[PDB]
Amino acid sequence: DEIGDAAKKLGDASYAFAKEVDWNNGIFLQAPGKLQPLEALKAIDKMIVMGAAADPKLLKAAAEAHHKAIGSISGPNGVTSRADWDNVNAALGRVIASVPENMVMDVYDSVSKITDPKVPAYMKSLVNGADAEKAYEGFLAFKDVVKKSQVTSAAGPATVPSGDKIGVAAQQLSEASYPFLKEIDWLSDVYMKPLPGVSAQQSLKAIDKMIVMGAQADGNALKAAAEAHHKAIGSIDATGVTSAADYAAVNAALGRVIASVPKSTVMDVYNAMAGVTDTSIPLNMFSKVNPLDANAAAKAFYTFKDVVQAAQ
Amino acid sequence: DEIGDAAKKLGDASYAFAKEVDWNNGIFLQAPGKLQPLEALKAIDKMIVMGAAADPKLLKAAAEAHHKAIGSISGPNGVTSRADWDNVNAALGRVIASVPENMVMDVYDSVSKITDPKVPAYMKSLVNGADAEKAYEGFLAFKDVVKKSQVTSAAGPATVPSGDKIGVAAQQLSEASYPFLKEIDWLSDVYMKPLPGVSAQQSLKAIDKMIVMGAQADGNALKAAAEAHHKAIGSIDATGVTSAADYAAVNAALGRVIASVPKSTVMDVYNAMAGVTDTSIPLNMFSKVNPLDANAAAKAFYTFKDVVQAAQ
Amino acid sequence: DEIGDAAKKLGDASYAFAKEVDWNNGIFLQAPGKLQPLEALKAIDKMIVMGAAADPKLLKAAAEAHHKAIGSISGPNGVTSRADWDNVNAALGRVIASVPENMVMDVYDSVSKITDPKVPAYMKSLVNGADAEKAYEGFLAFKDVVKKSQVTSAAGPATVPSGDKIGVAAQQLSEASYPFLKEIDWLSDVYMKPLPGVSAQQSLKAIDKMIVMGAQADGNALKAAAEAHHKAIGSIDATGVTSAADYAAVNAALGRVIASVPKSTVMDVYNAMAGVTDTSIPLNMFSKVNPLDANAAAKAFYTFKDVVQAAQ
Numbered sequence: 054d055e056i057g058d059a060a061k062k063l064g065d066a067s068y069a070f071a072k073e074v075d076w077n078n079g080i081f082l083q084a085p086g087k088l089q090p091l092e093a094l095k096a097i098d099k100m101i102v103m104g105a106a107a108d109p110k111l112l113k114a115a116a117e118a119h120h121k122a123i124g125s126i127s128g129p130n131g132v133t134s135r136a137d138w139d140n141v142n143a144a145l146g147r148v149i150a151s152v153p154e155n156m157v158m159d160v161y162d163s164v165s166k167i168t169d170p171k172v173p174a175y176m177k178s179l180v181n182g183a184d185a186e187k188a189y190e191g192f193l194a195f196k197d198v199v200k201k202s203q204v205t206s207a208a209g210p211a212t213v214p215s216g217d218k219i220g221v222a223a224q225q226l227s228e229a230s231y232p233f234l235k236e237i238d239w240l241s242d243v244y245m246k247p248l249p250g251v252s253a254q255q256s257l258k259a260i261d262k263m264i265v266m267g268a269q270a271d272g273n274a275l276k277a278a279a280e281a282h283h284k285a286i287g288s289i290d291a292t293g294v295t296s297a298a299d300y301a302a303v304n305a306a307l308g309r310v311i312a313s314v315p316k317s318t319v320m321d322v323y324n325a326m327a328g329v330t331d332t333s334i335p336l337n338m339f340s341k342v343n344p345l346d347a348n349a350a351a352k353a354f355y356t357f358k359d360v361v362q363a364a365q
Numbered sequence: 366d367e368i369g370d371a372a373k374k375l376g377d378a379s380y381a382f383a384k385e386v387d388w389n390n391g392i393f394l395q396a397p398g399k400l401q402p403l404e405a406l407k408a409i410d411k412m413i414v415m416g417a418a419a420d421p422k423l424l425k426a427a428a429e430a431h432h433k434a435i436g437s438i439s440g441p442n443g444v445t446s447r448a449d450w451d452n453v454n455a456a457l458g459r460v461i462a463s464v465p466e467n468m469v470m471d472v473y474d475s476v477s478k479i480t481d482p483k484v485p486a487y488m489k490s491l492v493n494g495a496d497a498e499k500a501y502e503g504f505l506a507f508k509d510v511v512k513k514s515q516v517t518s519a520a521g522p523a524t525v526p527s528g529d530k531i532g533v534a535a536q537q538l539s540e541a542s543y544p545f546l547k548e549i550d551w552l553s554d555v556y557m558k559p560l561p562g563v564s565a566q567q568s569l570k571a572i573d574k575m576i577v578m579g580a581q582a583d584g585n586a587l588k589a590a591a592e593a594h595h596k597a598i599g600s601i602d603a604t605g606v607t608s609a610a611d612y613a614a615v616n617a618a619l620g621r622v623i624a625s626v627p628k629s630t631v632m633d634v635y636n637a638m639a640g641v642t643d644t645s646i647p648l649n650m651f652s653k654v655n656p657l658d659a660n661a662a663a664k665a666f667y668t669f670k671d672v673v674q675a676a677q
Numbered sequence: 678d679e680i681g682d683a684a685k686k687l688g689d690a691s692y693a694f695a696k697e698v699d700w701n702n703g704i705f706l707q708a709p710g711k712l713q714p715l716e717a718l719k720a721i722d723k724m725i726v727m728g729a730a731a732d733p734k735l736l737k738a739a740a741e742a743h744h745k746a747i748g749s750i751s752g753p754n755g756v757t758s759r760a761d762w763d764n765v766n767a768a769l770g771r772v773i774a775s776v777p778e779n780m781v782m783d784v785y786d787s788v789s790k791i792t793d794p795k796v797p798a799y800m801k802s803l804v805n806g807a808d809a810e811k812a813y814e815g816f817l818a819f820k821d822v823v824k825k826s827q828v829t830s831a832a833g834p835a836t837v838p839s840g841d842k843i844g845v846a847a848q849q850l851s852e853a854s855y856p857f858l859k860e861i862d863w864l865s866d867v868y869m870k871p872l873p874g875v876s877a878q879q880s881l882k883a884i885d886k887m888i889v890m891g892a893q894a895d896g897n898a899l900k901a902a903a904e905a906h907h908k909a910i911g912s913i914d915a916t917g918v919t920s921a922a923d924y925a926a927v928n929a930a931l932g933r934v935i936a937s938v939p940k941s942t943v944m945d946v947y948n949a950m951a952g953v954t955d956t957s958i959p960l961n962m963f964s965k966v967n968p969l970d971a972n973a974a975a976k977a978f979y980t981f982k983d984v985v986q987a988a989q
């Protein structure tokens with residue numbers, strides 16, 4: 054199609070730059086400047102809104118394209134093959150076109166607010182400046198093709214079941230774990246501290262399992278889960294804690310997403326994460342909250358998962 | 366005997382409830398409500414007094430019964446066999462009967478003071494309520510049989526050697542390590558943070574080695590060590606630190622207990638604990654005190670253990 | 678030679694004491710009393726000045742003697758063989774004689790200022806007092822022989838290249854990493870907390886690789902690197918941070934030292950250290966500074982090492 058053909062031209066203009074970027078740099082785990090949790094949450098919210106509006110089949114295709122790309126990484130910089138680079142850009146171009154322009158610009162505007170003005174210059178300083186410029190020009194040409202195919206209105210909200218077994222169980226899980234949820238420091242920078250002894254390539258293989266799971270999940274269930282998070286962000290208090298009702302809706306929605314893929318797909322994610330998560334991490338998190346409430350939340354979770362397991 | 370026969374009936378009434386309890390829940394490592402170190406210490410003191418008054422042979426028998434019970438654990442809830450459940454209840458019933466009623470009630474009263482009123486309800490909410498009630502009724506019947514065989518007066522204090530080699534060495538160890546003892550935060554909740562990466566079943570196998578060692582130890586030496594701790598609790602200051610003289614008496618008493626079992630029994634405990642203790646734990650403890658005093662205490666300990674080793 | 682012959686007599690008088698010292702005691706990692714970072718830095722500075730003035734070939738010989746001595750350690754106290762003890766004392770005696778008396782006394786005076794008056798007594802209390810006294814008398818006799826051979830003037834400063842590839846690269850590394858250097862708490866006691874799960878004998882084998890590397894390094898490059906550190910100490914601010922220019926000079930000097938030994942020698946040090954450094958240590962250090970600046974410093978380092986690698 055058009056976007057696919059345009060992606061090939063984008064590749065001719067940008068692959069040199071892609072080969073120069075040090076993709077294994079740990080700096081990408083950090084905020085693009087000073088961390089501002091609540092301001093960053095507004096940007097995440099715009100992305101969630103956009104994700105919920107995008108075509109589920111195109112999102113699925115874009116996830117598969119990244120899974121394929123991870124398989125061809127090579128060299129010390131961790132760059133994917135030229136064919137995969139084009140495949141990813143085409144798939145993302147299609148996703149962008151499935152959403153109205155204002156949604157895309159909202160993301161750009163909110164991310165700009167939290168990005169330090171010096172970030173682009175520092176990033177360009179690590180590569181060949183001419184190649185970066187050449188890549189950007191390629192991008193400007195590519196976005197015109199995407200724009201021509203872009204829709205003018207957003208698709209409607211997902212269908213949410215009511216009173217299903219998962220929804221009822223999620224209510225019990227939520228009441229039991231809300232005290233624990235309120236104790237977590239949602240505004241801490243600890244979440245961006247790296248995993249001890251794990252390289253970027255090791256982390257990538259674990260993230261790959263999640264990408265694969267997302268590609269397999271029910272598109273509507275995923276869309277509803279994103280919508281539930283957007284609503285939850287609207288009710289947060291000053292410390293970032295959402296309302297008990299919105300928390301319950303988020304848990305029910307996630308339970309339906311889990312039940313939409315086979316058990317083996319979910320276990321692959323768990324096993325991969327268990328391989329990269331130092332045992333001191335769960336302990337460090339546990340030590341910052343009330344130990345009775347953490348155990349109450351955990352017991353409720355192991356009870357809730359039996360209902361999800363039966364539906365799955 | 367009577368208690369043995371009554372334990373079998375207690376089992377018919379309570380084993381269903383025992384099978385329902387999730388014994389692997391980590392909540393049991395936590396205080397039954399808000400942690401109140403000094404108030405909890407009063408309850409531990411009542412238990413120590415009771416332990417020192419109990420018949421040493423019956424305490425030994427009850428420890429052996431638990432060691433046997435650990436060997437038959439099965440299922441996801443970690444429940445011991447019906448035969449072992451009865452064996453444990455009978456052995457404990459006999460221990461309770463070897464101590465006067467007021468001592469037993471003192472424990473109950475002091476533990477009630479630190480237990481949150483909502484604890485029993487929360488525990489009952491996780492099992493079949495009817496089965497719990499049935500188990501409690503079984504307990505009320507069982508305690509009447511125990512009461513009929515209960516002594517009316519407490520046995521006398523243990524015999525403590527004087528000026529033996531261990532007692533003299535303990536004096537040197539105590540003088541050398543008291544500065545370190547004073548620096549430890551005895552009122553901290555860090556002691557109840559779980560062992561990183563260790564399941565309840567793994568911890569249980571390590572605790573089993575200690576139970577085995579206790580069953581092998583000299584009953585009089587154990588009794589004297591408990592009495593020494595009761596005295597030490599009497600002289601604590603506002604931060605929970607006992608007097609130097611009481612500390613020395615505790616060290617001498619523990620040294621005698623160690624020398625009452627063969628070296629292999631003590632090494633089995635050490636090796637099992639080494640297997641479940643993350644190397645960051647000793648470091649975390651060390652970092653909270655004066656490093657010179659911790660090394661002075663450690664050097665004194667490695668010197669003291671040579672005297673215990675020779676006596677053993 | 679004279680010092681060699683005198684070392685043999687020193688050995689007859691001191692080896693008994695050497696066998697009694699518990700060399701595996703972790704107390705030697707701690708300051709000899711209360712930690713006083715800035716006062717201790719003055720003592721290190723005197724040692725640096727002395728090291729830069731000593732004969733490079735004699736320093737190299739003394740390093741080799743320690744490497745040999747590590748190979749003959751035996752027993753629970755970690756004592757080297759009698760032959761190696763003498764070899765070490767002789768080699769050190771020769772180093773001491775290659776430097777003027779005032780430099781040696783300066784070290785003694787500055788170390789005395791930070792050492793608690795009770796340290797010698799505590800150390801003597803752990804060994805046979807008569808043997809310690811006998812060893813000290815042996816030392817007093819030995820130092821007279823060293824004194825007779827001692828030079829009267831210090832050798833001149835090392836020759837430093839200018840505008841070489843390493844020097845230019847060091848400038849870029851220093852500019853990129855200075856913000857990170859300023860954020861580190863140079864006055865913290867964390868640097869003296871032990872390595873989790875690593876015995877003194879395990880640490881010794883890792884330190885052995887560094888001793889071997891130092892013995893292989895270019896004597897002039899080492900001398901220049903020591904001189905660069907002495908200058909750097911002169912420009913520190915109140916928090917212990919040296920000037921940007923002195924920092925750059927230190928980096929260039931160290932880069933030349935690294936390029937003066939083959940790659941395999943440097944990798945042996947890295948592999949040995951990787952074996953004793955818990956993965957939580959780099960994380961703990963990273964969590965105390967700005968994460969963006971740490972990643973910028975790291976990226977700059979991986980770029981700088983390519984220039985060192987080519988020169989090597």
Ligand SMILES: CCCCCCCCCCCCCCCCCC(=O)OC[C@H](CO[C@@H]1O[C@@H](CO[C@H]2O[C@@H](CO)[C@H](O)[C@H](O)[C@H]2O)[C@H](O)[C@H](O)[C@@H]1O)OC(=O)CCCCCCCCCCCCCCCCC
Nearest residue numbers: 085100160161164165168172173185186187189190244245
């Ligand atoms: C644990 C939690 C998980 C984490 C959560 C997710 C993390 C979210 C944070 C992501 C951080 C993104 C930061 C990367 C910055 C890259 C933006 C870029 O370099 O920006 C470069 C631009 C270009 O600047 C240029 O500056 C000038 C130079 O161009 C000139 O030069 C020539 C080519 O060289 C051309 O011919 C051009 O026409 C000519 O004018 C011109 O004005 C250009 O038109 C242009 O404006 O800078 C600008 O716009 C201004 C800067 C804008 C700020 C960044 C927003 C834009 C892109 C990000 C939004 C997408 C969302 C990302 C996250 C979603 C997925 C994770």
Ligand SMILES: CC(=O)O[C@H]1CC(C)(C)C(=C=C/C(C)=C/C=C/C=C/C=C(C)/C=C2C=C(/C=C/[C@@]34O[C@]3(C)C[C@@H](O)CC4(C)C)C(=O)O/2)[C@](C)(O)C1
Nearest residue numbers: 076077122123131132133141145149154157196199200253
């Ligand atoms: C550790 C490691 O190894 O990680 C490895 C992981 C991988 C995955 C293997 C890997 C890879 C590949 C990667 C990351 C590729 C990333 C590609 C990103 C493409 C992003 C695109 C196209 C974004 C857009 C946004 C658009 C917006 C367009 C508009 O808003 C514009 C402008 C103006 C509006 O008026 C109109 C508009 C039309 C609305 C556009 O049209 O397109 C790599 C490199 O190997 C690294």
Ligand SMILES: CC(=O)O[C@H]1CC(C)(C)C(=C=C/C(C)=C/C=C/C=C/C=C(C)/C=C2C=C(/C=C/[C@@]34O[C@]3(C)C[C@@H](O)CC4(C)C)C(=O)O/2)[C@](C)(O)C1
Nearest residue numbers: 112113114116263264265266267268275319320322323355
């Ligand atoms: C198309 C699209 O865009 O997709 C995008 C969609 C998203 C959602 C945005 C996205 C994402 C993120 C994803 C998928 C997250 C996935 C999370 C999965 C979590 C799974 C968990 C917790 C699984 C487990 C399994 C466990 C098992 C525990 C036990 O067995 C144990 C050990 C021992 C037994 O004795 C008992 C037991 C208790 C039984 C456990 O306890 O937990 C992504 C990647 O961006 C892609």
Ligand SMILES: CC(=O)O[C@H]1CC(C)(C)C(=C=C/C(C)=C/C=C/C=C/C=C(C)/C=C2C=C(/C=C/[C@@]34O[C@]3(C)C[C@@H](O)CC4(C)C)C(=O)O/2)[C@](C)(O)C1
Nearest residue numbers: 094239285286293294295303307308311316319358361362
């Ligand atoms: C900065 C900021 O303020 O952020 C704010 C952002 C928000 C969004 C507003 C906000 C919020 C709400 C949040 C985060 C809620 C998160 C909820 C997460 C729920 C996750 C769930 C249910 C995961 C699972 C995984 C499951 C796996 C089940 C199985 O694998 C198991 C075990 C065993 C297998 O044998 C069977 C199986 C079935 C395969 C399951 O059953 O369920 C908050 C708190 O306000 C913070």
Ligand SMILES: CC(=O)O[C@H]1CC(C)(C)C(=C=C/C(C)=C/C=C/C=C/C=C(C)/C=C2C=C(/C=C/[C@@]34O[C@]3(C)C[C@@H](O)CC4(C)C)C(=O)O/2)[C@](C)(O)C1
Nearest residue numbers: 388389434435443444445453457461466469508511512565
């Ligand atoms: C992680 C894990 O797997 O852990 C596993 C570990 C094991 C060991 C294998 C295991 C097990 C077994 C367990 C815990 C059994 C516990 C049994 C406890 C029995 C307690 C008893 C009888 C207590 C009492 C107290 C009494 C008091 C009586 C009186 O005061 C009363 C009322 C009134 C006074 O007027 C008179 C009185 C007479 C003075 C009584 O008479 O009796 C299990 C379940 O498998 C879990």
Ligand SMILES: CC(=O)O[C@H]1CC(C)(C)C(=C=C/C(C)=C/C=C/C=C/C=C(C)/C=C2C=C(/C=C/[C@@]34O[C@]3(C)C[C@@H](O)CC4(C)C)C(=O)O/2)[C@](C)(O)C1
Nearest residue numbers: 424425426428575576577578579580587631632634635667
């Ligand atoms: C009937 C009854 O009720 O019984 C009850 C009685 C109690 C008491 C209440 C009870 C209990 C608790 C018990 C038993 C506690 C037992 C504690 C044992 C501690 C043992 C220790 C520290 C052993 C060691 C061994 C070590 C060895 C170190 C070395 O070898 C090492 C590595 C390397 C060599 O080169 C040097 C070395 C230095 C030689 C070490 O350094 O330490 C229980 C369970 O409730 C039951």
Ligand SMILES: CC(=O)O[C@H]1CC(C)(C)C(=C=C/C(C)=C/C=C/C=C/C=C(C)/C=C2C=C(/C=C/[C@@]34O[C@]3(C)C[C@@H](O)CC4(C)C)C(=O)O/2)[C@](C)(O)C1
Nearest residue numbers: 406551597598605606607615619620623628631670673674
């Ligand atoms: C909250 C509250 O306030 O709590 C307060 C409670 C108190 C009680 C009032 C209180 C107090 C005092 C306390 C805790 C004192 C604790 C003393 C513990 C002493 C432990 C000892 C000696 C253990 C051992 C183990 C030994 C093992 C020896 C061997 O294995 C070794 C190595 C090697 C083998 O080859 C040979 C061996 C021989 C087999 C040994 O030789 O000795 C305080 C501080 O006030 C706090």
Ligand SMILES: CC(=O)O[C@H]1CC(C)(C)C(=C=C/C(C)=C/C=C/C=C/C=C(C)/C=C2C=C(/C=C/[C@@]34O[C@]3(C)C[C@@H](O)CC4(C)C)C(=O)O/2)[C@](C)(O)C1
Nearest residue numbers: 700701746747755756757765769773778781820823824877
């Ligand atoms: C964990 C472990 O196992 O570690 C193991 C590591 C090893 C290396 C294997 C090991 C070993 C060996 C060791 C440490 C040996 C150390 C020897 C130290 C010797 C130091 C010497 C001679 C120092 C001096 C200083 C002198 C100063 C002399 C003067 O100033 C004096 C007075 C007065 C002035 O007027 C004149 C003067 C002339 C200027 C002197 O003349 O001599 C061991 C023991 O096995 C432990």
Ligand SMILES: CC(=O)O[C@H]1CC(C)(C)C(=C=C/C(C)=C/C=C/C=C/C=C(C)/C=C2C=C(/C=C/[C@@]34O[C@]3(C)C[C@@H](O)CC4(C)C)C(=O)O/2)[C@](C)(O)C1
Nearest residue numbers: 736737738740887888889890891892899943944946947979
């Ligand atoms: C005669 C005399 O007195 O000598 C005295 C002289 C001194 C100087 C005072 C002295 C001393 C101290 C000494 C020698 C210090 C030595 C320090 C050596 C540091 C070496 C380092 C950092 C080496 C590395 C190697 C690395 C490799 C990283 C990578 O390969 C990795 C993993 C993975 C690849 O994919 C990428 C990669 C990135 C390539 C790394 O990242 O770092 C001593 C002992 O007192 C003796």
Ligand SMILES: CC(=O)O[C@H]1CC(C)(C)C(=C=C/C(C)=C/C=C/C=C/C=C(C)/C=C2C=C(/C=C/[C@@]34O[C@]3(C)C[C@@H](O)CC4(C)C)C(=O)O/2)[C@](C)(O)C1
Nearest residue numbers: 718863909910917918919927931932935940943982985986
């Ligand atoms: C208490 C107090 O205040 O202290 C004050 C003391 C001071 C001194 C005044 C002060 C200061 C300055 C300081 C500490 C600066 C320290 C700089 C250290 C630089 C170390 C460097 C360059 C090490 C290396 C190692 C290298 C290894 C390279 C390789 O192995 C690599 C990777 C991979 C192989 O394949 C190839 C290779 C080539 C073999 C290299 O390339 O470089 C400060 C800050 O003021 C604090």
Ligand SMILES: CC(=O)O[C@H]1CC(C)(C)C(=C=C/C(C)=C/C=C/C=C/C=C(C)/C=C2C=C(/C=C/[C@@]34O[C@]3(C)C[C@H](O)CC4(C)C)C(=O)O/2)[C@](C)(O)C1
Nearest residue numbers: 097099100101103104105112157158160161275276277279
């Ligand atoms: C159901 C579900 O799971 O959904 C999940 C799905 C996902 C995908 C996993 C997910 C996600 C992430 C999301 C949506 C990412 C969104 C990315 C959006 C990028 C937008 C970009 C780059 C927009 C712009 C706009 C630009 C404008 C540039 C110009 O106008 C400017 C200024 C000025 C000049 O005059 C002209 C110009 C030069 C043209 C441009 O430069 O770029 C999420 C949140 O997890 C939800």
Ligand SMILES: CC(=O)O[C@H]1CC(C)(C)C(=C=C/C(C)=C/C=C/C=C/C=C(C)/C=C2C=C(/C=C/[C@@]34O[C@]3(C)C[C@H](O)CC4(C)C)C(=O)O/2)[C@](C)(O)C1
Nearest residue numbers: 409411412413415416417424469470472473587588589591
């Ligand atoms: C030498 C040495 O090593 O000793 C060591 C030995 C050990 C064993 C390891 C050790 C230990 C722990 C110890 C001693 C545990 C003691 C447990 C005691 C439990 C006591 C209980 C349950 C008592 C009660 C009383 C109750 C009363 C109930 C009723 O009256 C009530 C309210 C009102 C109604 O009208 C009638 C009623 C319903 C009848 C009941 O409900 O329960 C220690 C401390 O380590 C020392």
Ligand SMILES: CC(=O)O[C@H]1CC(C)(C)C(=C=C/C(C)=C/C=C/C=C/C=C(C)/C=C2C=C(/C=C/[C@@]34O[C@]3(C)C[C@H](O)CC4(C)C)C(=O)O/2)[C@](C)(O)C1
Nearest residue numbers: 721723724725727728729736781782784785899900901903
């Ligand atoms: C190029 C490079 O890499 O260099 C590196 C090389 C090294 C070696 C690795 C290095 C290092 C460390 C250094 C230099 C160590 C220096 C040690 C010096 C020790 C000096 C001592 C013991 C001096 C004294 C003086 C004393 C005086 C005693 C007496 O006068 C007293 C009071 C009073 C009586 O009346 C007479 C008396 C009894 C006679 C004595 O008792 O002892 C460094 C810093 O890393 C740099």
